[PDB]
Design a protein around this ligand. Sequence first.
Ligand code: CHD
Ligand code: MYR
Lengths: 171, 63, 81, 70, 128, 88, 459, 120, 547
Amino acid sequence: YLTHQQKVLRLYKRALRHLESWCIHRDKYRYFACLLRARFDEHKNEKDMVKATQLLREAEEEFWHGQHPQPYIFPESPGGTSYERYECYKVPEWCLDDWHPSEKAMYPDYFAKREQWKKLRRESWEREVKQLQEETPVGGPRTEALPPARKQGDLPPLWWHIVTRPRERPM
Amino acid sequence: DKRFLKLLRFYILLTGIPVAIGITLINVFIGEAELAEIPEGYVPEHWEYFKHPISRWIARTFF
Amino acid sequence: SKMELPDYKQWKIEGTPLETVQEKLAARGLRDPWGRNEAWRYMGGFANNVSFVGALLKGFKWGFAAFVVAIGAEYYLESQK
Amino acid sequence: GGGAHIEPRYRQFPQLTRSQVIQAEFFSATMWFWILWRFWHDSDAVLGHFPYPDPSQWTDEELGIPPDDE
Amino acid sequence: SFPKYEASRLSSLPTTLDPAEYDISSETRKAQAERLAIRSRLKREYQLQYYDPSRRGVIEDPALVRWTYARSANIYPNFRPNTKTSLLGALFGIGPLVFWYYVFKTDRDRKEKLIQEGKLDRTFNISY
Amino acid sequence: SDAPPLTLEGIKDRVLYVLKLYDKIDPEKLSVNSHFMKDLGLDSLDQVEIIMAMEDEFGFEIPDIDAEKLMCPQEIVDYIADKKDVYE
Amino acid sequence: MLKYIIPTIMLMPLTWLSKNNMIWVNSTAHSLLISFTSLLLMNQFGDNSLNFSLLFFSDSLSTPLLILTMWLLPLMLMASQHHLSKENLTRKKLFITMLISLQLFLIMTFTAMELILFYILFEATLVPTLIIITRWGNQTERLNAGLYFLFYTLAGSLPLLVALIYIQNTVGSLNFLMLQYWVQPVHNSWSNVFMWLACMMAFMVKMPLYGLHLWLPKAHVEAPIAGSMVLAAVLLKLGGYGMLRITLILNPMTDFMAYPFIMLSLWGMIMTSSICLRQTDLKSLIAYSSVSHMALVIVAILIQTPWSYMGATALMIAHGLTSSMLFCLANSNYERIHSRTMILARGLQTLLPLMATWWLLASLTNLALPPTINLIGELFVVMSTFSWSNITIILMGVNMVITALYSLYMLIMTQRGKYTYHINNISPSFTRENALMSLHILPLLLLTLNPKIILGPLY
Amino acid sequence: GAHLARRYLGDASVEPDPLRMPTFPPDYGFPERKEREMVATQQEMNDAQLVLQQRDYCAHYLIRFLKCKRDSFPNFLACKHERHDWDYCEHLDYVKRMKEFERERRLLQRKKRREQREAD
Amino acid sequence: MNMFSSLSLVTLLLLTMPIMMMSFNTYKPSNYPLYVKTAISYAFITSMIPTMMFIHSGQELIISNWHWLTIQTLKLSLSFKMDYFSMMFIPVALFVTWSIMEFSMWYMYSDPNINKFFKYLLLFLITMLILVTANNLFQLFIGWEGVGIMSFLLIGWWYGRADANTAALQAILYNRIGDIGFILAMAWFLTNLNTWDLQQIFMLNPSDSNMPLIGLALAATGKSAQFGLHPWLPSAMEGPTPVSALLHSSTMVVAGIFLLIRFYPLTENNKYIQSITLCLGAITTLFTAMCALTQNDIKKIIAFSTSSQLGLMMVTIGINQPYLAFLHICTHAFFKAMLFMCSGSIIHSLNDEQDIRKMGGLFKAMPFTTTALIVGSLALTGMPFLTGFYSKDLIIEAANTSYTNAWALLMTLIATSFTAIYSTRIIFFALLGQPRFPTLVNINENNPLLINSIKRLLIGSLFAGYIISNNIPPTTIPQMTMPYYLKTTALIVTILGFILALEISNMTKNLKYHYPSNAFKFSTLLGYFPTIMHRLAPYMNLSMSQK
Ligand SMILES: C[C@H](CCC(=O)O)[C@H]1CC[C@H]2[C@@H]3[C@H](O)C[C@@H]4C[C@H](O)CC[C@]4(C)[C@H]3C[C@H](O)[C@]12C
Ligand SMILES: *C(=O)CCCCCCCCCCCCC
């Protein structure tokens, strides 16, 4: 799915990066980038769906033998230098329970508020069940999108871990 | 996880420490025998063919 | 902390090759939409940079000046025995 | 961490200090110091230890080689 | 020019060259939507347990069990006199064994006679 | 690496200052919450270029799906603030 | 040898007469205590073994296996009590009693001076195991694997009974000491070829042998942790004991009958190692891994070289310590996720720091890291094959590689990874769990300090 | 390799085979060859603790190099001159090695002309 | 004597005392990271006292300080071989380690397990030193595995990163394969010979030692990352830079060649080993550079840049140069490890950026970093009188002036110029050109600790390599006589690499579109050896396992 219209973009941005690494130099990059965008603007006004459908086959058949021998990839993104390098240090939140008493005695204040954080993780849970049963089509929910809370004091269902998910840098 | 090493550390040392001390104390004052020839008519014990005291003693008591 | 951000018209293409793309773009009948975006890669204190020849010859002026003195000192320290 | 003794900039030359720049030239200048300060007295190393004779400049007599008739 | 890559077991095709996905008709729209809703329902069904404070344990995945269950295939399938795989499959497990039978045996038979005639070196050999 | 801190107030202009060098926008008309398509009279293809600049500006890739919807500077700030978990 | 038999028996009243809540402690305290006296059995002599009476005796080879068995009973109890806490009082005494008897048969087995008596105890040793595996099994899938144990009796025990009897009538006695002096040259005949199969096929299945191993992977998949430990730590080692002793009288016939056995292992080692990389279970992966190491021993015994026997002794020891620890280590996770699947839980180093230290520790010596005894024996045997045949190094090299490949994989798959998000009962390591592993790893290294105690009798 | 090139690309026989070299009689018209002495006898080489490859005719100079070196400790720039005595003496041997070859090279080349006319 | 031997053994035991303080006690936390470094600092001094005595006396001492085991007619001990290599290779390793020691005390400030980090850094050092000092194959084998295992954890420090898990096992897979020859060698010396003590092995002077040496050839194939078992060495650059600096640049990678040198008396007569080893380096020494001409990863490029140096070392042994090759070990380690640390400086100021194309404008924005980058490169490229040139000019002597294969000398110089080629491609992006890093500037290296680390490791290459030459006593007949071009062919082709790459580098400035080329990808994609042999071979072993 996703339509070919959006499929145009998926080569617009990606093709630049391989071109970007090829360009290397800054003045080259912008100039060559203008060369590529100029080619896009050759057919950007083309509104023929058959041709626009047919004006994408060669582009993908054209880019394959132009793809970078060692394409650049951003650090934090998949395959990058910092690709999950710190996942070994990130710690689950739910393990807070098994903390030894004496250990917990160091942070009396922080744990006090958590009990309220979990409090609305429990009391709000029940109505959160019904909160989806009016936006619940028969035959299984059509999509995985979720609604907000249509009242005050509650929160959108299915939220606990993401809100409590650890931070980017444990240390 | 830290506590476990408390027991492992101490318990081995509970009698581990005297073990070296007991050996060292004997070595300094009792030390080790020296090989001697067999005067005719002297047949030793079974445990009188060893040098180290603990090795010597272990023979007589147990083996 | 406060990180005073300077003026946004400082970045410009005048006198730098960024506009040379613009000059050649007239024959191409377009313009770079981000002309002022990457002016820093040649502005802000990066105008002059020693090339490959200069890199190897980094600081050799002082060593070169001191090198002649050192070699001569051998004659100074050897002529008198 | 002495209170952010370096204040980072945005699209700018680094906020460096002279002290770091000082010692850079010493060794960088001294880099060629040893290269040439020994080239003068180690001149052979970069320009051969001893000349290599060209073989064609030899003779039968020096090699004691009887000529064809001999 | 740009000779299209030969699809291989160890090289999946690029996503933007398969002719199937360029056109997305009902024959593809119908299938795509059904999987998402089916996948969504699983997420919804799993979403309750994941975000329910009550649970203290490990979800008993039904997919995992079957995957593990199918691995331990012992006698239930397969037929004894199925010539397609029994004869050839049995070879992969009894074929190479005999090959080693002669490999080592030949050397030892070869080796023994040399010792009986001294045609092999052992002068400084003890560990045996 | 000592400390590369991040602050929402400091980041505020980092997203907006990216727009301050655009050649298709009047800087003064632009606002913190201005929708790009309507308030700024821009297009998705034009919007693509702005999203890219953030990756060179800050150094972290952006998913194709979520890049599109970031039509508001606050949302772009939210994406940067929320992804790195910056709250102050 | 009575000084260890009766006190072993005395645990039975202690297991029974004791109070309600001191059932575990009392046996644990003395069981550990008895092993201390077990160390006395290391009074070997250079030329002669130790002959107490006509009913028991322990040579240099026997003792190290004896120490492991006695040393292993208390460790089996430690792991047991967690899963048995829910069981009613009477049954726990029942289960505990079987172990005491199981140790009793074992200690008497390896020390037996008369082969038939060894044969008798050999059969007895199985009975406690079957109850433990069956009565407190971990599954209810009714595999109907009886044919394998029926096959064992048909192709194993029962033939052995006749051959043992035949030898006594012909030679005139089955006392191993007598056999040392009345052993006769077994010339070549079809009858002897049949006699030879009677003396060895019985022990081959228990090792086990490649092809005949189908029971072991399914035996551990169901046996509880208490049952599993003795099986791989002791029961597998019974065959080598008898095979080493019994082979005293099969020469020269063994000079050619060994080849089909040797080829089964030489190639069997690689096959098992590869499949482990495909296995989908922590215990089953260990199962075939167990077959791997045991395959090396079979080759050592058959060739009967002075180095083979030395290396074989440690391989049984190190493997017994190794696998036993691995089961306990693997069964540590079972105490949380109640599963054998290896991929259900991952990245446990994020939540069980000291647990991973054992995992890395145990895995290191599993692949025969130097200078540990895991490698002293395994490396001892590899050299011996060279004199028997130079080509063998190819398979040993491949086996060590793959054995090094999967051993680290299991560690990699579980500890070195990302935590399972949904799992929410990864409690901190308990004192009992960590203590159990420590008792395993530590002595395993210590013996590396002094190798002269598990070098076998040839040393 | 001019010598490598000329041998095979040229006639192979003329050039003596480097491995079998020398291959012709020592007295092939070469009279009254003075012997090559050895200053350091078997005893001195043995006590010198030198690699056999490090031992040769010129090695009798090589002994002088280290003798100063051992006493030179801790400094190292005290025995420089003595080294050239052995190295230059080594330098002469390399030329000799080159000169030794030619007497084998000349005979093969000269002998070709003699045999060419013996059957032309 | 007594003083010489006694003070020598302190280093191995002294280095281990901090380790014994990690498993016991809790007296002083937060100070161990400095504790270890000072021990090496102290250890270096005790590693220099043997240096003085050894040079003056040349006292190669084999000390058997235990009776561990005894089989029939065998005996194993925890002995050490105090000889030339240990006395001369230990000081360098500590010197490099001492530099790296303080380098890591700063870079890894982001790791709560920094104390664990040092719990293993000191472990590897111990094993490596025991390896070189080992008098017997077994004890030598132990170190052969300790480096193998200590690498496993250090390679995979961040166990989360799939690259670490895959790469760490990739190397372990290869590292184990090399041991097959090692275990084979012990068997042969146990069957044909009867012991694993080098005293008996050399004295008996085996007459047919093809098989034992063949195992040695394999040993270095994977452990030192020679071609055929090379790919893992670059794979180590998926983890910490300091970890790569010592293990895979100066200490572990030297294992493969070391064994051949340690068996010099046997290796001489059999030329069958020499040819394949000579050819093995030949294929590798260029295959590394040939691949490295267009690679685009700062850390991996350095790995390849290191690979070629290692690949050539085999050729140096392949030409029967026992003690001359040894020098290349120490000489290369200094700067290359410094380059790792220098690459650390780049990555530091870059805030986790490593693409070579995302670097530039660092001549004055990174003054100190720029300072030592050229020396290592120039020393690496063979600048006269520098640490790397001595071996480069000396080593090429015999190979080009002694019996050698025709094709062996072919790739010998083709890649030699390539050695400098990537250096210019590196210093160009690294230092030449205006900055190309992301918009925000995180550049700051006013860190005194690192300057101490750079200071210590900047000096050695400039001067220490020069100093090391003087003291070492004669052991060979140097080939001081040779044709001038052969003596200067390195002095001729050396400048070509800089210029030829400079010819390649500068023409790419022009605003002209690019064109794909197969060879541009064959070398860039690592010759397809990893891209292929690390898919099917795992598939063969695993996909076929179930049947
Ligand atoms: C005996 C002494 C305890 C002194 C005390 O009461 O703190 C022990 C405990 C802590 C140890 C010290 C700490 O480990 C670190 C100290 C500072 C440097 O790291 C060098 C070693 C150093 C000097 C150590 C020397 C010695 O081992 C110490 C000093
Ligand atoms: C081969 O290894 C070197 C190639 C050059 C051969 C030299 C040919 C021209 C000069 C020959 C006469 C002078 C002697 C060097």
